[PDB]
Amino acid sequence: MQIFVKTLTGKTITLEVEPSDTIENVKAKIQDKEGIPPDQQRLIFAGKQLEDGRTLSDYNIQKESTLHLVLRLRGG
Amino acid sequence: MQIFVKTLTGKTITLEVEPSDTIENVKAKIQDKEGIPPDQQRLIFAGKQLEDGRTLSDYNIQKESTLHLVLRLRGG
Amino acid sequence: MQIFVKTLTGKTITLEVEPSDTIENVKAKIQDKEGIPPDQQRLIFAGKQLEDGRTLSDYNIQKESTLHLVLRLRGG
Amino acid sequence: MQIFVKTLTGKTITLEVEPSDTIENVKAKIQDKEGIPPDQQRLIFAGKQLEDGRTLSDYNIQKESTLHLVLRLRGG
Amino acid sequence: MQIFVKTLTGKTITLEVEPSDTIENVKAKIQDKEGIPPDQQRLIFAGKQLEDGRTLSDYNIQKESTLHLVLRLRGG
Amino acid sequence: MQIFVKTLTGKTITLEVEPSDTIENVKAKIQDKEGIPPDQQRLIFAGKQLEDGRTLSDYNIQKESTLHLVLRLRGG
Amino acid sequence: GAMALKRIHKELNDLARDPPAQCSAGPVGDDMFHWQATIMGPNDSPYQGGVFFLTIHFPTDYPFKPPKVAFTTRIYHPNINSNGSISLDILRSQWSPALTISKVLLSICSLLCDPNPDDPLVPEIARIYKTDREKYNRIAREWTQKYAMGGSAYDEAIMAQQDRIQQEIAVQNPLVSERLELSVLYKEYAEDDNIYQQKIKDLHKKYSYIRKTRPDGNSFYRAFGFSHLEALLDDSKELQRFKAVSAKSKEDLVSQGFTEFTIEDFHNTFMDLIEQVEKQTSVADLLASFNDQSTSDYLVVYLRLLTSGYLQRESKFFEHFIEGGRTVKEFCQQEVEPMCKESDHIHIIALAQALSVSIQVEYMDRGEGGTTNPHIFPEGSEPKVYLLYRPGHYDILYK
Amino acid sequence: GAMALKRIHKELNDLARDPPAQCSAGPVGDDMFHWQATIMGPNDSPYQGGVFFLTIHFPTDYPFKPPKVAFTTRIYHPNINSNGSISLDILRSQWSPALTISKVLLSICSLLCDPNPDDPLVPEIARIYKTDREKYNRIAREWTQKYAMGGSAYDEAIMAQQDRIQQEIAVQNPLVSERLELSVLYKEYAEDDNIYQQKIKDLHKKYSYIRKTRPDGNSFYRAFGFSHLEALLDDSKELQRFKAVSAKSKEDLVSQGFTEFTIEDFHNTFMDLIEQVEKQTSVADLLASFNDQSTSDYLVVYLRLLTSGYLQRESKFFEHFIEGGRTVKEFCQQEVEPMCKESDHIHIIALAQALSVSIQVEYMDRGEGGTTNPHIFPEGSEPKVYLLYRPGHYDILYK
Amino acid sequence: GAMALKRIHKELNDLARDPPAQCSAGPVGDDMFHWQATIMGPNDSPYQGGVFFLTIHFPTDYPFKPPKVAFTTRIYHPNINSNGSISLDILRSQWSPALTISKVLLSICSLLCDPNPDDPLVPEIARIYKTDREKYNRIAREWTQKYAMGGSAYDEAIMAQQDRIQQEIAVQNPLVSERLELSVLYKEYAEDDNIYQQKIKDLHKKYSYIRKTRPDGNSFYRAFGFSHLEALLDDSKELQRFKAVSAKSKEDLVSQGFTEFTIEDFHNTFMDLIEQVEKQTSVADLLASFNDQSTSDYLVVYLRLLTSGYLQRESKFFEHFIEGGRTVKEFCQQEVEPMCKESDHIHIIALAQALSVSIQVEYMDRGEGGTTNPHIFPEGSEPKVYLLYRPGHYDILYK
């Protein structure tokens, strides 16, 4: 219902999402705040890379879980 | 009006269909002939991955040729 | 017209004086009541160290309050 | 009567002072030459830090003694 | 008759000279191509420094021998 | 009309000549009196090396003074 | 001298136990007395988003003297001169032998949020701070967005992120854990996830045990390695047949274009790991060898190179299977050869065919029934090695 | 080869025996082949007053090749390019295996006093030198007063000053000298100082012996340590009672906010020093332990931390005693925790109350009589430990 | 990782076996994880002729992470930011554990010949590349001819040249070869050189053997050393008389102004080499000692210093013999003291008189007859030591 995504800057951002939501949806909700395009976003929950088209209930991210946002800034 | 599918297990499986069908029912037909479910299935017609909602003649998918099938195995 | 003095040995010593006296004769009064000589004495009224030549009402030193006394122990 | 203060630059400077002089007075006489403010001066005689309000006869600096001038340049 | 001088840049340069030629002449023929003044040239055949006024038949450089050109770029 | 020559072997050898002679025949005269051949000989009159083609009064070589003789020993 | 280097390790351990996300440091390779620290601009400050490197040099006698610390990145601050040195005086006058570097750089991170205009290194920046603020902020923002924010630099920070992650991921998880009954899985999941508990009931159906691997991005290769290596602890004919293919694979790859001297390293780790199979070691001895960081990782590297090798070999088999517009080799260099890059179906089939072996992969995600789908690769070959796919992660199962 | 590193030490010994005041160098920490040298601008040159650092790298084979030396500080000279390299050709063409680094940098210091306009690295600076001198001088002066003269940098030099001082102060004085009769003091002072000789006559009155400490700025803590530690060589009940408070003090400080791992080091030196009291060692064995540089200094560090601890603990007792406008903790970080910072009355009372012990301090300065004033802290407690205060310095006295 | 430093050596061996002429690297002194690479601008590119240095730092864990590589030299390229970092992504995204540094910098050398305008680090240089080429080329050419082409830097390259040469010169030739009959010389020369074969016939006349020295520029000193040292293997009175002069020579030189500690090194190598003469060693044992690189070179250094010493001593004897306008000491520092600098007549006479010994030098060049001219120095002293001068090279002859 509510989760914690911890970014590159050490700052944490909290978000409101159902466990039935996409990852795509989550990246979109993050883009709603920071404006970081879901393109340049990639998410990691407990050592697991996160797939754009899966759910949260898929990866066992529960309420009050902390996942990381690594930017893949389009390189070179 | 039918096409073929190739799986890298070494096998070539072939199914019957119409040019107007979506991707979903196709995956389902493969789920009948083989038995790997659509939530596991990812198919690519010569370099581009196909979306569930879109149809066969939508992706234009001439009925001779072969699309290649790969399970969704992403992990790490 | 008199004030108090506090030494960090744990002791509070009190002396009689006038608001117009210099610092020197004051130190001397402490040298009578206790017996540590003025050439050893350094006194501070709430954060600022007092100079020999200057008077009591010169440093304004209301006669209620307390100035704190420390020997000149600098060494190394 | 005459002493030697050795600075940071390796250069020595000689000065004319009575053993009854202050340290403050000495720093002032040094400021008379180099212009280094007594503020930013601090003096060391034979491992002993020197106190602005003491004498030379105090610290046993005799005629022809060598003490050092370390600048405390107000920091940061 | 024909020899190989290997320079600083790893590049090799081939030259046409009789065994009776000077070293001065060789440095001149090199200056004919690269424009490197015979001044700033110095030549080394098989660990031997080469003298401006000697011959090739002197130093036993035969047809198809490889000597090096070290530039002494006038220094400092 | 003759001059002297000094060799660093410790020896001073002297020869007869005219002010108008070249360097070559001079070296040859030394080759007669001592027996080290001109192709080995290098002579310097007070700091400057003499060239074969040039004459004695050409290099001006007053006939009193001494030129110094060194073999061509360059090697390494 | 000795006590110095002895101490720097203690401080590195202190900084190790607690990662300070924004402010963190470390040594440069060989050198203990040369350190380098990445510092992210704190949010709600003009410096945010930019990355500021700084170099550290320790005195020959630590900690009786303060470490010299300076920004290698240009920055606009009243207390940092454009020449790079910092005005913080715990590095000069007020230094104590009781202070860790942690104190220092966490005081610097504090110097960024709140500047110190009264004790300026550069009087002009101090003056601008105390008078016109908008100027100060804007200036600091372009000084960020040219010098700090520019390009490359970011990578190091984003690399640090990774390091900060899979180290703590490695604090919870070991490389290869013990052999535990799979009844533990019930505890991992929720009470609102019934569907998963049904998948897991149906898992207790087939397999009696599980062994878990660290989610480092190598999950598949690590699992494959341990499972198949302990699988040859029994079949001797297969152990020999395997060993031979391994030995062939080296020059097979070198003749496929891989530089030999570099891949020899990894080869020998593979072969020694086989060697403690060959001479039979109790499974726990092998596990101990596998929980060795370098031995394990060296193995994983080789397995990746082997998938790459078979992929290059078969390029026509594959190339039209490749998702996107890459080649087979482009896909190798991007998705297979490098470490900690995710493994997919193609990877597993490639490695399986490469070593000519069978594997079974148990897929469980959201599938409506209690159905956990087995996958035997390549088809029909009766697998003696069993793995579990949870989404994004691989582990191993035991019948 | 090994002869290289073998040789660099010989050269470092040569540079060691004779300090070259303005021009001096040394290695960076661990690394022998990486050196760094500070060079002061010679007086009567535009560079005077500025400090010029330069880095040195030795060849893998010394001394068959010249060391690479370059200014890390920007400077205006015809023979030094703004890119930092130097034009002196004993580093290039004319190098000999018979030359020390001493020769090199003393030749550089010579390159600064007298430039070399005929063999320019930068032709324009050479041109300015040979034509318009005032321009050259002024330019070199601002290039000094921005790049060289700026801020920080100076610190290293001013730190070097300190090092140059209390090392030679350590050449005359040992840490803790022997136990000598105080009749020696007569010899230290003059014949025109009668007043002092009277103080000293009056000192022979009370005490039969003296033991002197090195004036390193730690005079008080060093003296306190040795005196009180040999004082417990007798009283066993006090030795035990002391030991217990010591052990308590560690976590007392950690629970007061000090980082544990860093202060543990110093703690164990304290406790081992107590341990050679506990098991009774003849006083000279303890002294030998005290004249050990690290053992002693580690102790002194702890004593400073202990005064700091009691000060923080009592903060209201103190804060209005503090000379100036600082806090108690500000005063700790500034005047107490750091090494070689002077000790005052507050310091002594703080430490004394901290360890709950009595001390007597004999003050002698200019006081008119033959009076040398005893001070018992805290009051009335009959002291078994006696110290002497001469102005600026502490030593210990024996009844 | 110890595996890291273990691996860096393997890579250094790979780079060692094949020199990559334009693109080559190596460690800095002590440090294995700090490397530095010189890169020449490839011809047919605007960068040609300029030299580009770049520094390399290896990760603490190699090779699981790419090495950080950056140009320390400013350069104009779309893929290299003016801040020095490179845009090549095998150093970032695409890195593999199977890649040598060789691959990296040979890919960089490839990045210079062919730029990469589509993935720019600096968009403006990319833009200029894709549109106006002449601009790009010219710009890159001045960025070459200021930053890269300037002065100084070149030396390292030109030094490398030397190193590349006399190492391979050392691959063919040893320091001091065996004792071989001089009939081998016939084979060295041509059939069109009859004149030389006549000189050599006339050499077989006088001497039955030859021993050859490596043409390292020290040819004379090396030959002199071995010949005279084996010559004292017989005459005991001369061995003692020699030893004494040797011992005197040290302080003779120190009192002549040479620093003692530096020349002591070389002195002891001289004296130990004498010591295996004194106690008689079979000639081959001495040769084995002479084919030791350091022992030999240390000797050669001392011999050079000794010629220098006698030259300084005699300065008036010489100064007007000096070719050119130098002094005696200027000539010493330039032509005698430094290693690998050629030796001439003055050198031989100087050393001969210095040690007070006789030598015979056989000169053969183009002289019309079969005449090979003997030279006894100083004159008349019957020489027990014989050398051969071919032009540019010295060897030793045996009667």
> Which CATH number covers residue D54?
3.10.20.90
| The two three-digit tokens of residue D18, written as one number | 């009575």
Boundaries of domain holding A17: 1-76
For helices I2-17 and I101-113, the axis angle rounded to 10 degrees is 50
**DSSP run (H or E) holding H170:** helix H154-172
Judge whether I323 is closer than 8 Å to chain H, CB to CB. no
With a CB cutoff of 8 Å and minimum separation 6, the contacts of C46 are C65, C67, C68, H320
Cβ atoms of I205 and I362 closer than 8 Å: no
Output the CA–CA distances (angstroms, integers) from residue G44 to A4, G48, G77, in the order listed. Answer: 19, 7, 15
Return the H-helix or E-strand segment holding F29.
helix F24-33
Residue with tokens 């006090």: H238
H115 upstream amide cis, omega within 30 of 0: no
Nearest residue of E to residue I24, measured between CA atoms: E10
Q: What residues does each domain of chain G span?
A: 1-173, 174-215+358-399, 216-357
**What is the amino acid identity at position G182?**
L
H175 CA to centre of own chain: 13
Q: Which two tokens stand for residue I383?
A: 């020489």
Place of tokens 């005449």: I371
Strand order in the sheet with I373-377: I180-181, I209-211, I393-398, I386-390, I359-363, I373-377
Superfamily of domain I216-357: Peptidase C65 Otubain, subdomain 2 (1.20.1300.20)
Residue I1, both tokens: 């990782």
Residue found by looking up tokens 């080499």 in the block: I273
Going by C-alpha positions, the residue among H337, D8, H292, H339 that lies closest to residue G65 is H339
Taking CA atoms, what residue in H is nearest to I332?
H94
| Cα nearest neighbour of D76 on chain G | G87
- Kindly report the backbone phi and psi dihedral angles of residue I217, in degrees, each rounded to the nearest multiple of 5, phi listed first: 100, -15
Helices (H), chain I: 2-17, 101-113, 123-130, 133-143, 154-172, 185-188, 194-206, 219-231, 236-254, 260-278, 283-290, 293-313, 315-318, 328-335, 345-354
Show which of residues 33-62 on chain H sit within 8 Å of chain D, judged by CB atoms.
40, 43, 48-49
Partner residue facing C37 (CB), from H361, H367, H378: H367
Query: Which residue of chain G is at minimal alpha-carbon distance from H153?
Result: G85
Nearest-by-Cβ selection for I95 from G27, G152, G338: G338
Look-up of token digits 């105390």: G130
Task: For CA atoms H278, H279, H280, H282, give the dihedral sign.
Answer: negative
Number of H helices, E strands in chain F: 2, 5
Shortest distance, CA E67 to any CA of chain I (angstroms): 10
Q: Which residue of D has its CA nearest to G119?
A: D76
Instruction: Provide the shortest C-alpha distance from residue C1 to chain D (in Å).
Output: 30
Our CA angle for G157, G162, G163, nearest 5°, is 90
Nearest Cα of chain F lies from the Cα of E51 at a distance, in angstroms, of 8
Distance from CA of F75 to the nearest CA of E (A): 7
What's the resolution in A? 3.8
Q: How many CB pairs under 8 A join D and H?
A: 61
Asked if H286 contacts H229 with a C-beta cutoff of 8 angstroms, the reply is yes
> What is the arrangement of strands in the sheet containing B3-7, beginning at the earlier edge strand?
B11-15, B3-7, B66-71, B41-45, B48-49
CA-CA distance, I27 to I23, in Å (whole number)?
14
CATH architecture under which domain H1-173 falls = Roll (3.10)
Could you say which residues from 268 to 307 on chain H have a Cβ atom under 8 Å away from some Cβ of chain D?
none
CB contact under 8 A, G216 and A47: yes
As its CATH architecture, domain I174-215+358-399 has 2-Layer Sandwich (3.30)
Per-residue 3-state assignment (H helix, E strand, C coil) for chain G: CHHHHHHHHHHHHHHHHCCCCCEEEEEECCEEEEEEEEEECCCCCCCCCCEEEEEEECCCCCCCCCCEEEECCCCCECCECCCCEECCCCCCCCCCCCCCHHHHHHHHHHHHHCCCCCCCCCHHHHHHHHCCHHHHHHHHHHHHHHHHCCCCCHHHHHHHHHHHHHHHHHHHCCCECCCEEHHHHHHHCCCCCHHHHHHHHHHHHHCCEEECECCCCCHHHHHHHHHHHHHCCCCHHHHHHHHHHHHHHHHHHHCCCCCHHHHHHHHHHHHHHHHHHHCCCCHHHHHHHHCCHHHHHHHHHHHHHHHHHHHHHCHHHHHHHCCCCCCHHHHHHHHCCCCCCCECHHHHHHHHHHCCCCEEEEECCCCCCCCCEEEEECCCCCCCCEEEEECEEEEEEEC
Distance of alpha carbon B65 from its chain centroid, rounded? 12
H349: nearest CA partner in chain C: C9
- Please answer yes or no on whether G261 and I97 come within 8 Å at the CB atom: no
The structure tokens listed for H247 are: 């052990």
Q: Which letter, b or e, does each residue of I294-315 get, where b requires 16 or more Cβ atoms within 10 Å of its Cβ?
A: ebbbbbbbbbbbbbbbbbbbee
- Between chain D and chain G, the number of residue pairs with CB atoms below 8 A apart is 14
Secondary structure, 3-state, B27-57? HHHHHHHCCCCHHHEEEEECCEECCCCCEHH
**How many Å lie between the alpha carbon of G60 and the closest alpha carbon of chain H?**
5
CA gap H364, G207 in Å, rounded:
89
Compute the C-alpha angle I115/I120/I123, nearest 5°: 115
Which residues make beta-bridge pairs with G180?
A: G210
Give residue for tokens 């060289």. Answer: H148
CA atoms within 13 A on the CB side of G68: 17
- Tell me which method was used to determine the 3D structure: X-ray
Question: In this complex, do B71 and G345 lie within 8 Å of one another by their Cβ atoms?
Answer: yes
Chains touching G by CB (3 or more pairs below 8 Å): A, B, D, H, I
Question: CA H170 to CA H178: how far, in whole Å?
Answer: 15
- Structure token digits, residue G164: 């900060």
Cis status, amide bond into G63, omega within 30 of 0? yes
Query: What total number of domains does chain B contain?
Result: 1
- Ramachandran assignment for B60, one of left (phi > 0), alpha (psi -120 to 50 degrees), beta (any other): left
Q: Side chain identity at G231, as an amino acid letter? A: A
Do the chains contact at B74 and G344, CB–CB below 8 Å?
yes
